[PDB]
Amino acid sequence: GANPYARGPNPTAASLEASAGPFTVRSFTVSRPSGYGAGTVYYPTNAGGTVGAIAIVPGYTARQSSIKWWGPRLASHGFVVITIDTNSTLDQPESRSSQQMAALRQVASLNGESSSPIYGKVDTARMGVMGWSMGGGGSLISAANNPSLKAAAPQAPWHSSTNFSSVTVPTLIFACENDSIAPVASSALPIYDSMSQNAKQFLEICGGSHSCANSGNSNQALIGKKGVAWMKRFMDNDTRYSTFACENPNSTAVCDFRTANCS
Structure with missing residues (x-):
């Protein structure tokens, strides 16, 4: 019957392009980071159920600032999001994955x-x-x-x-x-x-530039719509988001679009 993981109102382009989703967000600093440098957890206070968790890692030399805008953007749509600093700013991909x-x-x-x-x-x-x-x-x-x-x-x-x-x-x-x-x-x-x-x-x-999807980018409507739609479709199995997740947004800002096996 009903998808047990569906959260929030039925999506629209406007609701996914907005700066904030429907849920109220709060955040805290991780008091004793276990296996990484530092973290901030963003969470919805009023989701109607448990939500999935997403972990976000910066690039070489970079810190939480570079990726922080995803924390509120995703948590406001019903996710717990942890943004991390790595043990060293100079850690390589395998270490970043761990x-x-x-x-x-x-x-x-x-x-x-x-x-x-x-x-x-x-x-x-x-x-x-x-x-x-x-x-x-x-x-x-x-x-x-x-x-x-x-x-x-x-x-x-x-x-x-x-x-x-x-x-x-x-x-x-x-x-x-x-x-x-x-x-x-x-x-x-x-x-x-x-x-x-x-x-x-x-x-x-x-x-x-290399920072085009980082905090402060000028395409938060499009990038945030796609990131939230992808995570809703696949972390929540939420097919209300199938068209937002799979579509070519046919947008001025898109200079290459490809997709496969999307439903």
């Missing part, structure tokens, strides 16, 4: 800690991974190693290998057309093309 999974583990721990603001708010069986550049490569390694993850949505990803043919997790890749750090043609697009077994999507922002 730390991302350690952050998801700690959100699972906090869900069982009666003093935590997220006590009983998380469905620890439903998790997703996001991140920028080496933190995006780390997200893809997390998905490859942990195929029970329900969705991945890295941005301007990079890894030392572009072969993610093992990934069976639904994966949306955000890319930035004018990326000079991890050029689309040598990084994000090969990574996308490698993935044969999954629902997948490629969305490249016109004229975007």
